[PDB]
Amino acid sequence: KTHVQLSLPVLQVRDVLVRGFGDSVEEVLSEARQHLKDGTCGLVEVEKGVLPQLEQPYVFIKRSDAAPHGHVMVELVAELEGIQYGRSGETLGVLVPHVGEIPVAYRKVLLRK
């Protein structure tokens, strides 16, 4: 399937134990996709002060369209030193590994895979 319905645990930035997916744009996009498939991916909602507490490169989920079955259609865009790899809509948040942190909410998305 080109799209997969996922429910992403929303984590508080200060709870996150592993603050990024790796060391290159290509690696963080790869790892993000692997964790999304394996159900081991969390989402941090971006506000003032959140991104400097996480590790670059960043992986964003961005709205790709204007929402089947409650699931917002999203795609992945990476960012490193102010350059984005991909072009998409509004940021729903920044993806991080999930290693058992308690979420505050779930974000239903339809991920372009």
Side-chain angles (χ1 to χ4, degrees), residues 1-112:
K1 282 179 188 312
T2 67
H3 285 79
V4 61
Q5 281 179 349
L6 301 170
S7 285
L8 293 188
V10 177
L11 307 182
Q12 305 199 313
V13 68
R14 289 183 188 280
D15 288 334
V16 173
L17 299 180
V18 185
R19 286 170 181 281
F21 281 116
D23 299 336
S24 73
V25 166
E26 291 159 77
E27 186 183 15
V28 300
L29 285 170
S30 185
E31 284 295 325
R33 285 194 171 94
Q34 193 66 54
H35 281 84
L36 284 162
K37 176 235 167 106
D38 298 337
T40 56
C41 193
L43 177 67
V44 183
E45 293 187 324
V46 176
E47 280 184 347
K48 291 300 200 293
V50 165
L51 283 178
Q53 294 187 71
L54 297 174
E55 292 175 348
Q56 298 196 37
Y58 309 128
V59 174
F60 300 107
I61 47 158
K62 284 180 165 301
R63 195 194 209 92
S64 61
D65 184 22
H69 315 266
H71 294 253
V72 176
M73 295 201 29
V74 300
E75 61 200 333
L76 301 192
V77 174
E79 180 185 308
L80 179 55
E81 297 154 344
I83 302 176
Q84 296 201 334
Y85 301 78
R87 160 178 218 275
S88 189
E90 190 194 0
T91 292
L92 273 73
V94 50
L95 297 184
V96 294
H98 187 223
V99 296
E101 300 95 333
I102 307 308
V104 292
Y106 287 91
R107 199 71 208 258
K108 293 182 292 176
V109 304
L110 197 44
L111 169 70
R112 193 175 298 169

